[PDB]
Prior knowledge:
It is classed as oxidoreductase. The structure is cut from a larger assembly and holds nine protein chains of nine kinds. Chain A has two helices and no strands. Chain A has helices at 13-24, 33-57. The longest helix of chain A has 25 residues, at 33-57. Chain F has 558 residues and is mostly helical. Helices cover 64% and strands 6% of the residues of chain F. In chain F, α15 packs parallel to α22. The radius of gyration of chain F is 25 Å and the shape is globular. The longest helix of chain I has 22 residues, at 56-77. Chain I has helices at 2-9, 15-18, 43-51, 56-77. Chain I is mainly α. Chain I has four helices and no strands. The C-H interface holds C 35, 38, 42, 45-46, 49, 53, 55, 57-63, 65-66, 69-70, 73 and H 11, 14-15, 18-19, 21, 25, 28-29, 46, 49-50, 53-54, 57, 76, 79-80, 83-84, 87, 91, 100, 103-104, 107-108, 111-112, 116, 118-119.
Amino acid sequence: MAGLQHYKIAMDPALVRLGSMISNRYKYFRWTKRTALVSFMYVVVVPSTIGYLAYKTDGLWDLRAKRRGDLISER
Amino acid sequence: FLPEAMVGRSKIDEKYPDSDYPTLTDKEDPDMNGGYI
Amino acid sequence: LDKGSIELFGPYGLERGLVKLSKNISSLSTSHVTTYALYILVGFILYLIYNNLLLDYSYLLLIIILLLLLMMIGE
Amino acid sequence: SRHIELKYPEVFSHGSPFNVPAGFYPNLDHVIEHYRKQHLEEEERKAKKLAAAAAAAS
Amino acid sequence: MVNRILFWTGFGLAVRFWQLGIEMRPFFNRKSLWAYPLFGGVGASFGYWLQSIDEKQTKMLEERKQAILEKRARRAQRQAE
Amino acid sequence: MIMISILSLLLSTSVTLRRDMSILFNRISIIALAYCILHDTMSLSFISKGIGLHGGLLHITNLTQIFHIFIFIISILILQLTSFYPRKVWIPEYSSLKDIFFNKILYYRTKIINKMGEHMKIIEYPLILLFVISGAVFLISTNDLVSIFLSIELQSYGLYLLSTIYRNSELSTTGGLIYFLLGGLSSCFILLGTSLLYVNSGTTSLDGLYILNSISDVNSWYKPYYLNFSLLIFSIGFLFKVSAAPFHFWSPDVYDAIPTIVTTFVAIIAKISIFIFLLELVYYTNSNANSYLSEFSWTYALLISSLLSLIIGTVVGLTQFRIKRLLAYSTISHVGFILLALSVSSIESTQAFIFYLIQYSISNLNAFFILITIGFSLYGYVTNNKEYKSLLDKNNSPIQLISQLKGYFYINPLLSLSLAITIFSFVGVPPLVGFFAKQMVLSAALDNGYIFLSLIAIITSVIGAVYYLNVIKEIFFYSPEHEVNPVLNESDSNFSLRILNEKNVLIRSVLLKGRNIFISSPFSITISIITNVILLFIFMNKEWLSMGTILVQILFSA
Amino acid sequence: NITLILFLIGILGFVLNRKNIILMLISIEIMLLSITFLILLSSLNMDDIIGQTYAIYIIVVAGAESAIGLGILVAFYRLRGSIAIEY
Amino acid sequence: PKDAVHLGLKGAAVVGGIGLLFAAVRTSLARKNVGPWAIFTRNGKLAATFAAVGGAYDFTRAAAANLREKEDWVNNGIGGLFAGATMGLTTGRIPRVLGFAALTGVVLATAEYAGSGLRGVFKRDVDEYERKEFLRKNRRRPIEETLAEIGEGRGIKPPGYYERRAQRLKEKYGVDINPVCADPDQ
Amino acid sequence: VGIIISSFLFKMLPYGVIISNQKNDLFFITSKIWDGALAENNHISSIGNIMYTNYNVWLILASFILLLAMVGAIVITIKP
């Protein structure tokens, strides 16, 4: 099939059809209630949550050479 | 004053069919996988 | 997301829409010399309005966005 | 540059020489003098560049 | 590594090479070999000319810069009052 | 010199009807334009913002004279298309200098070299060509409102004539009609703008208009609204002639309909003269103090058109399938960049304007030269494609569809790479000259606070790159639809060639085939020089960029 | 004032006309006459013979371009046999 | 302050008038004989839509200016948000509503932040050589200016960090700072 | 189109063309001069005094335009 002859495989039609559906799936995406919520969870909320925690706690601590009677809290 | 095969949107429609971009419905393609049973 | 929204809200959506937008604008190119004369006159009039009436630039940009919107719509 | 320099200063010599009313043309002596000065400086600026440099120096 | 004559001698050599490739004609047939010295010779001539142009351009740009500091000086000195 | 050549050529042309003189007349026009370069090279030994000439109706600047020479050089390069036959016979036994300069070769050339092609039988073609040049150089050197009108009609009327000079093509007469009808409307707006200047100012002199503009730019009874409004109407007519959006509809139709060799001249020469003319008029009318004048400045029509050209040129090119319409839309996007640089009136943008205009003219010339050469190369190839058979004016425009370029990399790989380099220069990929042109315009627009236009320029550039890539994909990613002609190489279909000395005595006799039929040297060399200038610009940029730097310093010299 | 109204008539020729290409040539002639009439009257108000000279060269050039336009129309009509736009 | 309703009406009129212009061209370019009254019958929707976007846009920015009591780039993007939303409502597609609102609000906001020169950039009217030279050679700055922008800590520990560090911790946690000596002899 | 275009160009017309179109009316006053009327030229004479000398570049430009028109119109219409 390709430029260089390979071994003979039992190219299963069902598995071939499955691997083509995956490669073509992007053409059939649609905006629905489900697809809008999932795409909003992963892209906005969860990243903005991490960004909130990263922003809120940036500089909150330093562990370097901390001793008894001296806290880890930096701010 | 110019022929259709040079300026017509008809030839553009043949060169770029609207069908080349598959649009469907939850009815025939609920799983958005192209109608894969 | 990967085979989904990020393709539709990304390269695949742009390809779909811009081909649509490209075809509609070209449909206004009829090679009818009388129709072109009308377009030149209208562009002439719009340039006179914008400069004579001290139009807000935001009015101009909104008009262009509208002209893309309508052109984005078929027929 | 904000100051416009005439490409055609000779436009000061335009005007019909026929049927000229007495006292019609304004006096332009200051205008003439302005361009005598501009010509003389330029001629003097070349006169020193070649007399000082490329001559009596090399 | 920007030598006007070496670069433009090579440019003329490259023009002949690309030309023969565009015509799909052999790059080195011995009866046509006079052309590379010719193309590179004309290329070297264009670059000796560019040498003189660059010299005059440098002098004129250097003269303009002086006029620009000169203008800024006499404007700044006039502001001292 | 251009006027002596036009009159002298016309007299020689007047008393002949021989269409075999056409190639000779084209060559004499090349020689004549070479003298025009010589006389204008002689004239550059002075530094001045301008010297009014001939009663003050014309003027000369260092800028004016530089672009006279550029117009002459572009015209000599284009004139090669009608001065040398497209194909030649080459053999190793006739390649030495002693051969080309002392011996002769003989064969039946007529069919091989297309001796009787339409583009070799138009006696008056080089003469109408020189008429357009005269209008272009007179427009550059124009100092007066009436001189403006006369020069623009002179250049415009010649371009209409050239679009129709192929009088047996239904496409060419149709394209000539369209350009004249819409072009005549455009000329009314120029005359209307010039007339409104005269009726209000009382002068036809550009000097006097600049003086009126300069004093009125202070910080009552005769407030000078006319100047911006008139130049606005005046500019709209010039935006049509450069095919700037939204005044661009005519050019994809006119450029496709007229023959490709004609399109080469028509689509290049006119933009150079109008843009250079506009540059000076933008400088001397540019208000400094932020007064009521600056708010109605006519130059916003240039900034709006640059915006509209950036969008229309790139978006509408996405769906073009005919190669000449794509180039027309590719041009519109590039005048969008050119108009941005003209609108920002900075020292930086004027250097960017000057460089962009020259490099785009050279680059657009290469694309047309490569497209004509590919058309002349398919003579020894055949195809069974049903689409290609249904094309009109195949002889005038051999390449009409992007699909015709499919697998051209397998027909001529190095010529296909020259096309790819040129197209990649159009997108702005470094280190090609096209990148450095876009880079200077963007840096000058950014430095003047034109952030929004700079952002649209980058965004439209990615859209524009799509159809540029689309041309490249057809040439490289697919095998060709054109097959070599069997009867040209069939082991017995060999034509004869005689090699004879200075005394017409035989020396040798060689039997030749289609593989001995090559592209003519003028076209391959011109493509090769320009392609290498595009590719190797980063090593050769000092003099070219220093020229524009000095030119702008003279224009801006306080 | 009349000159302005005439320019509108030439302008209005392009608005109202979808199929008459000959009317497009005539509407340019109306526009050019309207602009030349404006220059002539202004030249009379400002006692300037240059206005009359400018108008003479517009008549010469507009007459020259009418001949080119008719010649281009004749080359067009020789092949088509119609000056009508199918619309 | 500003009149939100009055400004919107002017907003609705100005860009609706161009829609009325584009509506007449469609009627003029109409092929079948529809008469002169198809300006508002077949294309009245087109002119109506323009008058709606221009009204929504100028209303809300003015309204956003009143609510925020400020005049900046935020208001045009907000104005463009409903302006974009209004156009999407005509298509009756929620993704069209959001996307065209996003497109318009973004372009119209970067237009006001950047100040596109379509009407003309602001002239500095100063020695522009001098501004570049100052920006070119301002190679060392007082540490306070940086501390305002970047703050304290995160590896930025100017001399005197530890003293103020104890004071900050005492004010917030009420704990004295005193690291223990690591030498038994002390 | 009529309202838009007229409202813009009319504002551009100088007083000479708009003073007497569309109770207190203004009358134009005229008197004689003698030094100016020594030898009057007709308008054709006054044009002739300058169009070949002072402004002969316009005449040359027009001549080349007429030459282009004759050559062009002929080249595209007649069988060679």
